[PDB]
């Protein structure tokens, strides 16, 4: 088959700073008809893939001219002159000369911006949920830059590490930061059996954790 290899696997880069991604095939992409079939796609989180370039250097309609396609035979290169907040996502490369119409493995593009602390919010189990067998306390730690963060729960001081489910958002196309949510979940009774619920996030912006909590005895 035609093995397509994209070298930069991941790539962080400051907005306005140049970014090249390389795609190399195990076979020449120049066809007998005289053309070389190589197109660069882009798949932002959530949405479907979008082709930016085709025929190694031709640009699709609407595709901003900050993208440069070049290469020949087996060595092709993509180039964004100045990366903007909307360039985030994974880039793929495919070849349409040989039949398995193979794809490159992908190149994650992560936009470097300054650090930002999470904007933590705490939420108590809504009565409607309480009417069921359990209760879930949710904590929203959003808008921090470095994806790495860690939230530790506490119930009356005694830290909770069981019954917690965290979830990250993946870089936001605007404001380019990250987000996460942690949900501690107990049994209805095991819930109202306590008083203070603590959600605390340790990020690099400070040396002491960010703490958000609530008391069942007061709003």
């Amino acid at each position: 088959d035609v093995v397509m290899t994209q070298t930069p696997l991941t790539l962080s880069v400051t907005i306005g700073q140049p970014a090249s991604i390389s795609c190399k095939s195990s076979q020449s992409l120049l066809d007998s008809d005289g053309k070389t079939y190589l197109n660069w796609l882009l798949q932002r989180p959530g949405q479907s893939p979008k082709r930016l370039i085709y025929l190694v250097s031709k640009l699709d309609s609407g595709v901003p001219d900050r993208f440069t396609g070049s290469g020949s035979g087996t060595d092709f290169t993509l180039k964004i002159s100045r990366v903007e907040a909307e360039d985030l996502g994974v880039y793929y490369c495919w070849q349409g000369t040989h039949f398995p119409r193979t794809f490159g493995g992908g190149t994650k593009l992560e936009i470097k911006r300054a650090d930002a602390a999470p904007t933590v919010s705490i939420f108590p189990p809504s009565s409607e949920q309480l009417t069921s067998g359990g209760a879930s306390v949710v904590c929203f730690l959003n808008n921090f830059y470095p994806k790495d963060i860690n939230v530790k729960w506490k119930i009356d001081g005694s830290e909770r590490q069981n019954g917690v489910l965290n979830s990250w958002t993946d870089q936001d196309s605007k404001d380019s930061t990250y987000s996460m949510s942690s949900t501690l979940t107990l049994t209805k009774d095991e819930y109202e059996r306590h008083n203070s619920y603590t959600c605390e996030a340790t990020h690099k912006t400070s040396t002491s954790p960010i703490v958000k909590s609530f008391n069942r005895n007061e709003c």
Binding site: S48, Y92, T102, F103, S121, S126, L165, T183, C219
Partner: protein, 215 residues
């Protein structure tokens, strides 16, 4: 216009077949081939097959044995049908124009012998609001559902900025999704925030307006 809208089952039981209908529009099936590529979670875009304008197809060796791509030139519809689906064939299936690259919305396939459980949408409201007229953040929780595809929105798309929907997480074989919204302090009391949810599988359309509380 030009867009390939697709349709198919989100859940399948092992061995059972999968059939997805790509209904293209904006161009001619007698002039463009339609590709079928899928995307195994984490893995990536894998090419499965194609049917050219001349009705002639080309398949990926690895799938040929159980793939059947057909179409209807006049109805503007391609027909993808794979057989003997195993759990690792769980992915998002696409339909992408051969030429001017237009792709489909995608169709996710879960391959398990498990329920289709309808979600429980519980609102999330701040016990005590922020006196400083800066921001107020509300949330929505969608617990207990199976086939991962589920849509969520705020004030039916009207509320777009400040929305953060976190991918659903799976615990004891169930998914839980969660979304947030951060309006200014002034908005929540005056403007009516509501989280509209819908798990396409059980046909569950729900609306949860975030209301004030106090304990």
């Amino acid at each position: 216009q030009v867009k390939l809208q697709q349709s198919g089952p989100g859940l399948v039981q092992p061995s059972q077949s999968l059939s997805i209908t790509c209904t293209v529009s904006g161009f001619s099936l007698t002039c463009y081939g339609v590709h079928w590529v899928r995307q195994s979670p984490g893995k990536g875009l894998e090419w499965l097959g194609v049917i050219w304008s001349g009705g002639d197809t080309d398949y990926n060796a690895a799938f040929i044995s159980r793939l059947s791509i057909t179409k209807d030139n006049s109805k503007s519809q391609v027909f993808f049908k794979m057989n003997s689906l195993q759990p690792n064939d769980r992915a998002i299936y696409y339909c992408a124009r051969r030429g001017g690259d237009f792709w489909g919305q995608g169709t996710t396939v879960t391959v398990s012998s498990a329920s289709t459980t309808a979600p429980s949408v519980y609102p999330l409201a701040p016990v005590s609001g922020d006196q400083t007229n800066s921001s107020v953040t509300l949330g929505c929780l969608v617990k207990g559902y199976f086939p991962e595809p589920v849509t969520l929105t705020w004030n039916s798309g009207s509320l777009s900025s400040g929305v953060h929907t976190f991918p659903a997480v799976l615990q004891s074989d169930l998914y839980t999704l969660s979304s947030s919204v951060t309006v200014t302090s002034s908005p929540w009391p005056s403007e009516t925030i509501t989280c509209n949810v819908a798990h396409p599988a059980s046909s569950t359309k729900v609306d949860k307006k975030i209301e004030p509380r106090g304990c």
